[PDB]
């Protein structure tokens with residue numbers, strides 16, 4: 001069974017999730033939409049792997065739908081929108097952290113350092129919960145983002161680590177509690193740059209990990225869920241690698257075509273000079 005401390009820990013994480021995860025995206029509005037040297041550009045074409053169409057269902061019953069263009073200087077038409085969605089998600093993640101007592105008690109410098117290290121990872125973890133793996137679409141209330149079908153199909157889509165990560169994590173069919181513990185483990189990473197209380201964060205991380213392992217042991221006896229704890233930890237390590245690569249991806253794009261919002265600039269360390 002879970003201890004009283006472990007049950008309290010999960011409850012506080014679920015409470016935070018409940019309060020700060022707008023699962024229907026109802027307060028996401030007033031966002032931008034697409035209109036109605038050489039080596040750096042070629043690497044920036046990295047964007048092709050993440051191609052998505054966009055659907056917006058109106059409250060009145062109307063449906064707007066956007067198919068993006070082929071590559072060739074207009075592969076940036078969707079960046080402002082994605083910047084606005086990412087920003088909206090980041091705010092939710094920041095609120096999540098701030099309502100957790102284990103995070104509130106850390107020094108303000110470590111709070112910021114932990115948020116800059118983990119914001120992308122937490123975003124992806126929340127996005128996985130609205131991912132429909134059958135249709136390859138993220139369902140964000142009135143908005144939907146659907147992967148565009150390419151020559152290799154389902155196989156070729158899994159070559160992009162981000163996309164493969166979303167498919168693999170969804171296949172584990174995790175509970176809400178397991179997702180929120182993944183968020184905690186990722187948030188409380190003692191080895192992010194600029195962390196001062198490395199011992200406290202490490203100990204906290206271990207308690208979340210132990211709580212997740214015990215939750216799984218107590219609630220998932222089936223042969224399918226053997227090694228689930230270790231599969232989850234391997235996915236978080238993978239996600240951290242995806243984070244570092246996609247961070248460099250976004251910074252390269254930002255160098256050629258500015259798109260990052262002020263909040264994104266904060267989290268990515270862009271000063272404005």
Ligand SMILES: Cc1nc(-c2cccc(F)c2O)n(CCc2ccccc2)c(=O)c1Cc1ccccc1
Pocket residue numbers: 047050052079082083085086127138145162246247249250
């Ligand atoms: C598929 C995907 N891809 C990217 C992503 C896109 C371009 C470059 C990257 F390096 C990327 O990682 N991003 C990152 C967020 C982003 C921030 C700034 C600008 C564009 C996007 C994602 O989160 C997702 C998941 C998702 C799917 C559908 C709706 C929302 C999210």
